[PDB]
Nucleic acid binder design. Structure first.
Ligand SMILES: [Mn+2]
Ligand SMILES: [Mn+2]
Ligand SMILES: [Mn+2]
Ligand SMILES: [Mn+2]
Ligand SMILES: [Mn+2]
Ligand SMILES: [Mn+2]
Ligand SMILES: [Mn+2]
Ligand SMILES: [Mn+2]
Ligand SMILES: [Mn+2]
Length: 327
DNA sequence: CGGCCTACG
DNA sequence: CGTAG
DNA sequence: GCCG
């Protein structure tokens, strides 16, 4: 019944098994902190299966036959159903290691390997890092400086204001260029950790050199707190608010129009949906997918797509709109 | 046994 | 390494 | 951790 790849099934934003999926996602995050991407992926995939089910799981029997449920994930669910808590999950939650790794990796510019080195050196708080600025890259310094604002959910009103100023700068940089909201907001999320935008021009090649021109125009309007030929810019914007301002993470991506459906698909996510789609493409169809194209390595040709629908069709998949890609 | 997405900055 | 979805 |  339930397909094994997340790209083969609809996953809505609101689902019926949050308690169970949240517990499995804690274990997935902890697996990542200990350097096991494989265990992280299994726990994420198991959590995602539960998000696609039509009803609450109330009895362990309802897991039988589900993909990515084996002995470990099933026992977590059984303990949650039988007792309301999973001892392993609670032990991870309360551990100093998990809490500190979560704190550090949430900083823009810090991943697991950096966080783990700092943990091993005895560092535990954001003030600990601030007291040792020479150990920070420029990106990390920006992430730490703006950490409180970046921990505030981004709202739709923020998205709408940012889209206007990005459209203004893009139109000043290149007439006819377009701006498309991507990321979680395109999947219907009401909040986010950032705003993602994809920029193109209908005439192939006209977008060459665009992103530096857009960045210069935003900087001159005082809108940029942090950035840095390029085609992806992971920015922090100074977003005006009533009487003040707040820092907001914004990702700006430029693609030629030939690549636009592939970039739109990749940048709309979810992260797990796209990893699963790329895995499906290669392992089941023999085709190589990324945000630039879909390559047949035996004919040595790229699939020409005019839409996301075209890509799903070439992969033999039922089309899913963005709001059903919340894997 | 090994794979686990696949790029850019 | 970091970033992205 | 699960699976091809
Ligand atoms: Mn439902
Ligand atoms: Mn186990
Ligand atoms: Mn028990
Ligand atoms: Mn980080
Ligand atoms: Mn986003
Ligand atoms: Mn490129
Ligand atoms: Mn093995
Ligand atoms: Mn993301
Ligand atoms: Mn293992």
């Amino acid at each position: 019944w339930m397909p094994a790849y997340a790209c083969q099934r609809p996953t809505p934003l609101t689902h019926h098994n949050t308690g169970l999926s949240e517990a499995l996602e804690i274990l997935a995050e902890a697996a990542g902190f200990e350097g096991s991407e494989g265990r992280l992926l299994t726990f994420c995939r198991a959590a995602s299966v539960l998000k696609a089910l039509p009803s609450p799981v109330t009895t362990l029997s309802q897991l039988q036959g589900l993909p990515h449920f084996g002995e470990h994930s099933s026992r977590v669910v059984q303990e949650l159903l039988e007792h309301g808590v999973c001892e392993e999950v609670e032990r991870v939650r309360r551990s100093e290691r998990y809490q500190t790794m979560k704190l550090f990796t949430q900083i823009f510019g810090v991943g697991v390997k950096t966080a783990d080195r700092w943990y091993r050196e005895g560092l535990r708080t954001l003030d600990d890092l601030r007291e040792q600025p020479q150990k920070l890259t420029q990106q990390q310094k920006a992430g730490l400086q703006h950490h409180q604002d970046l921990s505030t959910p981004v709202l739709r009103s923020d998205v709408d204001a940012l889209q206007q100023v990005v459209e203004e700068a893009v139109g000043q940089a290149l007439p006819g260029a377009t701006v498309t909201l991507t990321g979680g907001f395109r999947r219907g999320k009401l909040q986010g950790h950032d705003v993602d935008f994809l920029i193109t021009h209908p005439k192939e090649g006209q977008e060459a050199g665009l992103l530096p021109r857009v960045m210069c125009r935003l900087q001159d309007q005082g809108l940029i707190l942090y950035h840095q030929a390029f085609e992806r810019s992971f920015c922090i914007f100074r977003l005006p608010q009533p009487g003040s301002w707040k820092a907001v993470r914004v990702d700006l991506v430029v693609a030629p129009v030939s690549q636009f459906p592939f970039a739109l698909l990749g940048w709309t996510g979810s992260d797990l949906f796209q990893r699963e789609l790329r895995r499906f493409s290669r392992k089941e169809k023999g085709l190589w997918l990324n945000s630039h194209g879909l390559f047949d390595p035996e004919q040595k040709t790229f699939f020409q797509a005019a839409s996301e629908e075209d890509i799903f069709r070439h992969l033999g998949l039922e089309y899913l709109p963005p709001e059903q890609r919340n894997a």
